[PDB]
């Protein structure tokens, strides 16, 4: 396949919740897709395994990928530097969309979010690069641990993650 598939096995304070898989649109955003892929396999010697979903806002999104500081201020791309917004062709059309968190234009690192609602106003400010394939009901479960400011009520972690096939 041109578009890789990545899995996250999600745990809540160490207890297994379930698995979420993503199709990554390498056919539309190959550089953003490949960062997330490689970070999910650990092939670069670092990445998402053991990191957490530090900011979860019910009816908005689940955010993670800060595997360097674990609190939203860190993260790093495979590229040795934050990388540019590849394009904004894909839109935030509803639950399950996977998109890059950032700190302004052309600051993509490792942080990403899974939408749990349509978030159209983000179109043109976050690069969309994948979608949940299986386990949307796990993302829905994850949001119950969120709050209006995003603080989580328990540790939501990626206990394992990799590439399928």
């Amino acid at each position: 396949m041109v578009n890789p598939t990545v899995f996250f096995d999600i745990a809540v304070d160490g207890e297994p919740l379930g698995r979420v898989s993503f199709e990554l649109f390498a056919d539309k955003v190959p550089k953003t897709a490949e960062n997330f892929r490689a970070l999910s396999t650990g092939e670069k010697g670092f990445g998402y395994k053991g990191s957490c979903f530090h900011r979860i806002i019910p009816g908005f999104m689940c955010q993670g990928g800060d595997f360097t500081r674990h609190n939203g201020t860190g993260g790093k791309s495979i590229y040795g530097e934050k990388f540019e917004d590849e394009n904004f062709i894909l839109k935030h059309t509803g639950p399950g969309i996977l998109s890059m968190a950032n700190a302004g234009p052309n600051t993509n690192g490792s942080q990403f979010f899974i939408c749990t609602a349509k978030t159209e106003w983000l179109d043109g400010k976050h690069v969309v690069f994948g979608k949940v394939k299986e386990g949307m009901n796990i993302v829905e479960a994850m949001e119950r641990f969120g709050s209006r400011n995003g603080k989580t009520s328990k540790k939501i972690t990626i206990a394992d993650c990799g590439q399928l096939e």
């Binding site: 900011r55 806002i57 908005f60 999104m61 955010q63 939203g72 201020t73 968190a101 950032n102 700190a103 302004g104 942080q111 979010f113 978030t119 983000l122 400010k125 976050h126 209006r148 400011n149 995003g150």
Partner: protein, 135 residues
């Protein structure tokens, strides 16, 4: 919210036109600009005609203070949570890249980020620079 009045403004215009840049300008600016939003502060400065070089000194201080504010306030990860205001950048505080309601929100959040008071502080630093040059 009330966007500055032609009178407090014609006052400032006359303070600057007579008293030049004697130290008196600074207390006056503080009074005339009570509760102002960044946009009000800029309209008061923009009304000051001529005194080009002094105005550039002011701008230089504003640009420098805005850059320091940025340095000491890292940009939080987006996406911003619904019903939340992004945090102000320096350029937002100086009113060049913010809107008035945004300015108002900041001044009115609970707790508030007093963008008017912050920009006013930068302005006064630049006014002190001018006063020490010219007097």
């Amino acid at each position: 919210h009330q966007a500055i009045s032609p009178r407090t403004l014609n006052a400032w215009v006359k303070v600057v036109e007579e008293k030049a840049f004697s130290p008196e300008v600074i207390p006056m600016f503080s009074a005339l600009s009570e509760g102002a939003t960044p946009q009000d502060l800029n309209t008061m400065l923009n009304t000051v005609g001529g005194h080009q070089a002094a105005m550039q000194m002011l701008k230089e201080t504003i640009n420098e203070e805005a850059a320091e504010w940025d340095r000491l306030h890292p940009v939080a990860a987006a996406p911003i949570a619904p019903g939340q205001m992004r945090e102000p950048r320096g350029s937002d505080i100086a009113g060049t890249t913010s809107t008035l309601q945004e300015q108002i929100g900041w001044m009115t959040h609970n707790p508030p980020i007093p963008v008017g008071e912050i920009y006013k502080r930068w302005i006064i630093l630049g006014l002190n620079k001018i006063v020490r040059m010219y007097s």
